[PDB]
Symmetry: D2
Subunit: 241 residues, 4 copies
């Protein structure tokens, strides 16, 4: 990773922060993208709203201009939602489609010509097991993750010839600041609530952000040089339910 | 099917037309929806543009009000786009998402409460093997079909408790006006191109609209009473390629 | 028209789904040859008792049907052994039994049936597999792998033999109301109907399948309405995910 | 990997050899299993026939007895068959089921208790994209690889609680001595031609697969259980 440049979206979140940290430790220079990013330790800061076409279309070019090149993209930004389709509003729809699917589409569409010209690169999409398999009460979340997984596999096959390796990491349960905050606000000790949630996973715990980041780094690395369009599940053995 | 009322979208196209014909022959009353449906023999005509929120939201209620009940919805309307994602325009994106994914969402969101209050019903979505598996140079088409397959499965499990049976038929190659049109534009004689395409199918022929319509009818019939959230592939043995 | 004048072989014909498939086919006008360990009580058009684990019996089944009824249009591979346990609790005997009946036997039957059907202009083969196997489930390793194997075989054969006019597809149930299931409940002092209803509550549809729920899909797959289906794995699960 | 012990089956073959090399380079001690393993640099040699129940049942215990512990099992032995089902002989069936499915079954069944008692481990099965998706004219091969992928996933769920991580790597096209045999068509021309049907633009070398095996055995994959990791260079099954 020494000398390489990476864009990471959703950089202010749990998995995002862990991916940024791991890439910079590995010697990559990293551009960070989220709604707001000024406090994140990174090599280029690109705050913005992914729902705005101009910002998402322009992200890969902004990284190449600011840091001189673009080797890796991690599409990690994502909206969590829930409900049966009958409980899904138009606003829920627009927000999730815009950030979970359209934004990755725009970023990849822009990044690919840059990487092709440079002789190759790696894109890693953070999708979910929810969407590879259907689950109850989360129709919108699943369909956007299924759209993203499909995109990854199609792009993976379309752009392999240009030396661009496009793959996905598909978590299930993940420990994050916001999961813990949710517990605290409802009166639960977050550490205990997290352990209990872990007992529903065959491995016995939910993922830490680093569990996910380590797989992202593998996919971006030369060890994964023959993976194209692969969807790598990282779920501790836990089935969607 | 006697006494039953069905809504069919994309009623003016190849598969839609075969579906309308088959339901009517079997004694159902059919409401037909498409941009224009004036030519079509049917029990209720509902012209409009699926991209319009209010029209899509309103379709199921228009059928229940017009014909007195709503037993079956066939989401058959669909747009074909082609290209690697680097060749996919913003106009392409809006069109495919709006018609292939957002329209079925709006129609199901509206139909489900109506059917639930009436003791159940059946929804059949026409998705595609392209989507279930990735194919070259059709990134947008695949991702919309994968989103629709995922929605089918999630809704199928969310709403089976209300007696609503939601499944999808997933064709691969079908001889339809749009498949032909696509060839002519490129610019091969459609009849020759269709014949050549038929030869790439292990079964030894391209599917006709009736091959698909017969499966849609199965899915809406009592024979399929235990199928919920199933994705029924109808590909003559041919892999996505 | 339809199944009139056609001949079918159904295995596991004394069991729940098998028995429902035999009845439905004969009502639709087909003559049916039944196979199971014992079949004497079964109303059918040819009786072929035997042990599917014996290579000679499984190899010879389609030919015995063609000789006995004059033709072979449809094969329903329905026989299956139920097993459970993590792989660490799976014995060599468990292994030999499940592989022999769930995988090796349909392999032998289809290998023998395909040439006969190819020579006669085509036919239909329907395998009863399981959603367990399509997705993994806890504590049933052997059951799952045999069902996965059968599902894979269905798809490869479906693709390989469609050019011969042979349509090979599978039905994949999840929860089904069988005599083994009901006997199991009866012995725990349960009311089997109530216990069956209770197990139904774990299915989004709200009930487990009756054997007729499954048989009507088997009939669809062997019928003209399914003429464009080759290598399809048709899930019939009432919405219930493997768990 | 320093101080860990791995068992690698099919160790005399292309992928097996590259896996053994990679593990020892990372500091693991490796026991090698195949029909003959005399030539292979390793810390324990366990030659034998996987079709023999006793041999397969005894492999994990032999490694624990010989090197003192068992941390990693790579089920890599495999038999290549071809044909439609109607061209598949009884001998083909026995050979493929025996080596591709029963052997890993026996090995995992024996390895699991040992690993569980030690606090955990990793098992990596080399399955295939063929089997996950169906492909023309290889019915026996596909079904055995499908069986093995299913076993991997079920075992992954069943034994994660004991700290055992069970996963599979699923190659498509790979340049291996065995591929080249069975071609002999001229081998290196055939390998190069096959190479050009892969969107990446080349077929995998054994090291391309071995590096994924190593990832899956490693600490970076500590949250993967029952995952089937495809390594196909973008190439769909066909
Ligand atoms: N031809 C095949 O090989 C292929 C393969 C798999 C699935 N599909 C799908 O099957 C279904 C039927 O389509 P078809 O194959 O008969 O092609 P078709 O064009 O002959 O018919 C599809 C219909 O969708 C309608 N539609 C498109 N945009 C619309 C809009 N903005 N508002 C309202 N209606 C609109 C069209 O006007 C049309 O009549 C679709 O969902 C399609 O994508 C067909």
């Amino acid at each position: 990773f020494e000398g390489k440049v990476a864009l990471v979206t959703g950089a202010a979140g749990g998995i995002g922060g862990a991916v940024v940290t791991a890439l910079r430790a590995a010697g990559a220079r990293v551009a960070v993208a989220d709604r707001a990013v000024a406090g994140i330790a990174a090599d280029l800061h690109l705050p913005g709203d992914l729902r705005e076409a101009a910002y998402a279309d322009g992200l890969p070019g902004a990284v190449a201009a600011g840091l001189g090149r673009l080797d890796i993209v991690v599409n990690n930004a994502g909206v969590i939602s829930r409900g049966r389709i009958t409980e899904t509003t138009d606003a829920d729809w627009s927000l999730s489609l815009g950030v979970n699917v359209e934004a990755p589409f725009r970023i990849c569409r822009a990044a690919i010509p840059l990487m092709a010209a440079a002789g190759g690169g790696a894109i890693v999409n953070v999708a979910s097991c929810w969407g590879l398999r259907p689950g109850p009460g989360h129709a919108l979340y699943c369909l956007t993750k299924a759209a993203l997984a499909s995109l990854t596999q199609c792009m993976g096959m379309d752009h392999a010839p240009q030396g661009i390796r496009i793959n996905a990491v598909c978590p299930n349960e993940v420990n994050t600041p916001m999961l813990r905050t949710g517990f605290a606000k409802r009166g639960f000790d977050p550490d205990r609530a997290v352990a209990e949630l872990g007992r529903t996973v065959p491995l016995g715990r939910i993922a830490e952000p680093e569990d996910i980041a380590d797989v992202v780094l593998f996919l971006a690395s030369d060890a994964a040089r023959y993976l194209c369009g692969s969807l790598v599940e990282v779920n501790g053995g836990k089935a969607v339910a």
